[PDB]
Amino acid sequence: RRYQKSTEL
Amino acid sequence: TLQKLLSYTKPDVAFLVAASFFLIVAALGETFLPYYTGRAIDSIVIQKSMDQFTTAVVVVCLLAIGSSLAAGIRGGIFTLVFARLNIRLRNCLFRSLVSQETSFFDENRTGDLISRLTSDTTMVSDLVSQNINIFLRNTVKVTGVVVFMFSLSWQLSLVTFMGFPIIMMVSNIYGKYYKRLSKEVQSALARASTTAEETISAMKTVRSFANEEEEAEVFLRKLQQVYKLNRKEAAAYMSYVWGSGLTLLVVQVSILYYGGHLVISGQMSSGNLIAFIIYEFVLGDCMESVGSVYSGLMQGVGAAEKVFEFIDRQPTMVHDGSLAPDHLEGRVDFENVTFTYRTRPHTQVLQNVSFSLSPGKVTALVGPSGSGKSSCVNILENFYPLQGGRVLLDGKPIGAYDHKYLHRVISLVSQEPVLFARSITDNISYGLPTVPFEMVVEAAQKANAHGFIMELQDGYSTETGEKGAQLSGGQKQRVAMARALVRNPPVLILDEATSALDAESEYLIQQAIHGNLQRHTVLIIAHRLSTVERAHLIVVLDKGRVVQQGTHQQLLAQGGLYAKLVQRQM
Amino acid sequence: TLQKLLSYTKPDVAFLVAASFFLIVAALGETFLPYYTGRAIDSIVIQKSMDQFTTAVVVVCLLAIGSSLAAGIRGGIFTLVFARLNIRLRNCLFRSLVSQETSFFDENRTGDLISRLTSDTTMVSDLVSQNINIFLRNTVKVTGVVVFMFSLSWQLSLVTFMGFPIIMMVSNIYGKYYKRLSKEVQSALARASTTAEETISAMKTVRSFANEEEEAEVFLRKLQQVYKLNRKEAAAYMSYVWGSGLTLLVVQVSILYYGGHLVISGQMSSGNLIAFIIYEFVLGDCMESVGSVYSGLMQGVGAAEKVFEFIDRQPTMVHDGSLAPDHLEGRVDFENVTFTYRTRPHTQVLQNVSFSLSPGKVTALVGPSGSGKSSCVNILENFYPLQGGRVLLDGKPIGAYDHKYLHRVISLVSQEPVLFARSITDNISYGLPTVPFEMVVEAAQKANAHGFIMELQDGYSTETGEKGAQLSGGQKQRVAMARALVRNPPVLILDEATSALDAESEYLIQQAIHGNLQRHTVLIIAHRLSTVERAHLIVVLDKGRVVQQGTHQQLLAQGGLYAKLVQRQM
Ligand SMILES: CC(C)CCC[C@@H](C)[C@H]1CC[C@H]2[C@@H]3CC=C4C[C@@H](OC(=O)CCC(=O)O)CC[C@]4(C)[C@H]3CC[C@]12C
Ligand SMILES: CC(C)CCC[C@@H](C)[C@H]1CC[C@H]2[C@@H]3CC=C4C[C@@H](OC(=O)CCC(=O)O)CC[C@]4(C)[C@H]3CC[C@]12C
Ligand SMILES: CC(C)CCC[C@@H](C)[C@H]1CC[C@H]2[C@@H]3CC=C4C[C@@H](OC(=O)CCC(=O)O)CC[C@]4(C)[C@H]3CC[C@]12C
């Protein structure tokens, strides 16, 4: 289970 | 409010509207893709002809190419406006921030301020650039999807829309249960660690009594309590994932069964069902995405308001006074002044003090080391307003002259003279620009710092590397006193610390030239009484009340709290 | 070195093997079921009959139910093992930490150890609880799915294996370019911000020179230099997303078109292509997951090798001492002992000093008032070894006594006494088993503390709340020496701090009546020289060297540094 999503724009 | 945030994007609206336009285009492309995809699939299963040529090419070209290009240029100009927002906002905050009274700096901590600056600028720039962006993206996407659901099958859309909220409700219920229990676990572990930290903190006192293994024992007891707590939330996670899995299973299979009934009963073509379930999966994706990012957005907007409270805080006193004569006589006078700190108005650190300053002589003043001693230094630099009295220069108070001209005419040295991460030739005239090399080296030779200037690895124009950690006390003393003298002010103020590592050399220098030959009323606040023997006019006060004035032989004519201190300190 | 981590997972093998088994069966269900989903669609294209739904449900029920069941079991078991391993590591590390010598805590920090006792232990539990889990899950899943797609159609398998490396290569190289650019932007941002940080951190001087406008100028100059580069960064990001979307597009549509041609070629049923595209889909999901986890896994294993830096670390001081008589007399002596700190052996604080202490009498000592003569108290409390000479007790060296018995016999007070977040009677009856409460009452009488404790919120059973920040230091020293008196120590250590701002009658009663009227051989250090009157054996030192002894009446003759310091008090 991941905590937070990746960074994207 | 957020109207300030509204106003701080006004020169950016062209990029904003172009961004939103291209965003909406990429949205329409991404939502138009799957229905044509399903038409192509219903071709490839039912009518295995060369309409698949046509449907495949219209699937790829306009849809995929336009969506990709729109998304790309969208993200690009969003990064542009991110950069521009961060620049303008950081510049305006810092421009506003330095223009405040010193009391603001005494009240607030410093590292808090820079953390506020950097972190919150990046936070609000991320807020405008990323979160709002993808939020609008996903909302217009999901509205397009539900539009296609009401167009395709009102039956199927009604089924999935009575389904999905049940999933959302039970998942939220059991997830809140789960998260609450894990937070309790975290709290208990934090409690036990706080106990252990309090033990290890002053632990030599514990070693005085040899209690250590008992601290291990009570630590183990707390951890056993943690263990017995933890088993329950383990079972909770078990039940939560059980329920979520079984629910998604049963709703999905009901979808597939009823859709099969509809398609074999001859209601809609198969590709409609294909596109339908495709749209269900993309809907679930977008819903999970927005539910993820909403909380981060809320954190950002909560973080946003910490900036604007200081963006436009009104300073108290402005440097409205403006006067700059060509020269002066250097006549300074005190007049029944009763300053107190604004931060704690109970006390009285000053009370009704009056004395003039002789043009040319060296005025001296030493306190009893407990009362007001380092306060007139704050008066003479306009760093505060004053409660009683009024201090004038040449008849005119400090609110008459120009502020920059005031700093031009009077220098200042502290006791802990901080420097900057710059070169020496930089740091020698930190204030004054347009300086020549020869005046600087001449003053440095007058400073008697010139010795340890030249012997360095780069000598004159070396740099204060590793944040200036390559000097010592007397070094930076001589440096700062040079930094005073390079302006050549008509009035100097000198008060140094208690260490005074100069082995009587600099004092011989000033009482050789810079105490007599330099016609400046150089007021001296002195510690360690190393100069009270050699002065021109000496006073001493406690909190406003003077007990002795005159030359130091009048101080010898009445040694009351004068001779008692100097006989004490050898 | 990683076998150390094995060396603590050892008592957990049963939970481990059960977890691995259930993980395995969950993964097997997950990698099976979409092939049979394709079989169901193979029925929906051809054998649309009673055999369809039978096969469909008997697949999906068993498959999805077993999957979610095993996944739940696996999650619960890994939750349990996370809790157990975290507990064991925390207990063992904190236990081994406290038995280290005092010089460790002298050299090492404090908050670093608190980080090492909470955060990285949490991290190393997260390693074996999460990262190994999802890594093993996804690798066995990707092996299973690549086996299936290699089994179905080696042609389209070769297509995928010619395609995916191209995507991965171009994405990696363009993302590397991108990330290098963005990190350049961030580093330039920090480099620009630290200048303004330096200004705002010590702004008194620049306000004393009024150059803040120039600071804003050079600031925005730096920031303009930044955003010029940020333009290029954003353009590169645009090219990245363009290329990624375009390439994934063209490879996907090539797969689909070749699959359609091969379906009409007739050797491949539709369900084969169905399985191929779905399985390709999860593969991409699994590749995403492993690419996400690997970096955090490396982070965790990096953080892991800090707890074993100390959890097996040898103590430097033996504690074999065992002497514990029923009672003792207390002629503590010295033998020309010398001492320096273990940090720097050249910095000496003690050189060749000896003196006895007569039991049952009051004996004070003040050295040169510059040396940290509390080092003598430190060598009393056996906090360090000694270099030269020896220190004994009643003929026996202080080591050979039992450690707990030693700390039971001789008490101590510090200068700033500290306390815990326990009740005051617990804070008093601290290092000793549940001695009755009336002795605490007697101490509060003898400490003269029985009064002011009645003016608390409860009295005796009250607790020093608010993290212990509600009492003045005078009563802190009072309750501290009260903590000594309940031990009934035969020999005592007392050193009043510099303030001594209490009622001060307790000090003369300490010199005369409190302990001086009983069998309490007390050693005294003091700053307030009101104690130099009431004394028996005054010894004075300098830099760890004895100069005088005897009564202060003899020191009236040898007033050198004595009478010099008597008048230095006034
Ligand atoms: C079980 C969860 C909480 C953890 C397992 C790992 C998960 C990160 C994900 C990865 C992909 C997910 C799967 C994506 C595919 C779907 C198919 C779905 O099958 C249903 O019949 C829907 C119709 C169909 O897909 O045919 C059941 C859930 C499942 C296996 C999902 C279950 C959870 C999975 C395995
Ligand atoms: C986080 C996002 C990426 C979702 C993660 C899971 C997906 C990677 C997987 C899991 C289940 C998959 C879906 C299972 C159902 C199928 C139906 C399938 O329709 C059939 O292929 C039509 C027949 C044909 O194409 O000829 C299209 C792909 C799709 C949506 C799959 C697309 C990829 C999905 C969503
Ligand atoms: C709107 C974008 C900029 C951000 C939204 C999140 C994206 C990272 C994800 C979410 C859903 C994804 C899409 C889901 C549908 C697929 C269809 C897929 O079609 C494939 O080419 C095979 C089918 C075909 O040949 O058309 C192409 C990628 C795409 C658009 C995915 C591209 C990446 C998307 C948009």
Residue numbers in the entry:
A (entry chain C): 116 to 124
B (entry chain A), C (entry chain B): 169 to 738
Please give the exact wording used by the authors of the publication that reports this structure.
TAPL is a homodimeric half-transporter composed of a transmembrane domain (TMD) and a cytoplasmic nucleotide-binding domain (NBD) with an N-terminal TMD (TMD0).
To gain structural insight into the peptide-binding mechanism, we performed a single particle cryo-EM analysis of DM/CHS-purified ΔTMD0 in the presence of 9-mer peptide (1RRYQKSTEL9). A dataset comprising 102,428 particles yielded a 3D reconstruction with an overall resolution of 4.0 Å. Our structure revealed an additional electron density, corresponding to the bound 9-mer peptide, extending horizontally across the central cavity. The side chain and the backbone carbonyl oxygen of the glutamic acid residue at position 8 (E8) form a salt bridge and a hydrogen bond with Q298, respectively. Second, our structure reveals that both termini of the peptide are held in place by strategically placed Y405 residues, while the central parts form only minor contacts with the protein. In our structure, the distance between the primary anchor residue Y405 in the two monomers is ~30 Å, thus allowing a peptide of 8–10 amino acids to adopt an extended conformation spanning the central cavity.
